[PDB]
Amino acid sequence: LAKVDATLSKVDMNAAYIFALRPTFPYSYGYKQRFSNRRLTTSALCYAR
């Protein structure tokens, strides 16, 4: 599945370099507490490197 199109370091060098060498790994985060009544993050989004 690791695919950075070869015809991308033709029109934009830096973007292709960033995509190739610094991948992202998106994930969602949340917290749970039993008797809180405080809001707390539920479905945040982040990118782990």
């Binding site: 960033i18 610094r22 992202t24 998106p26 985060y29 917290y31 809001r39 707390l40 993050t41 945040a44 982040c46 990118y47 782990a48 490197r49």
Partner: protein, 49 residues
């Protein structure tokens, strides 16, 4: 930020969630399940209060 570019025009502060102001994500692997590489001994999580 979905891509690793940081140039003072990128906003890294979550604008509508203040949970991260006091609580850090825990991205660690759990406890090791064995404190002896060779021999298995049962241990417990106990109620301290």
């Amino acid at each position: 930020v979905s891509e690793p570019i940081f140039n003072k025009t990128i906003n890294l502060t979550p604008p509508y969630d203040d949970t991260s102001q006091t609580v850090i994500q825990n991205l660690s692997m759990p406890q090791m399940l064995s404190f002896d590489p060779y021999y298995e001994s049962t241990f417990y999580v106990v109620s301290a209060d």
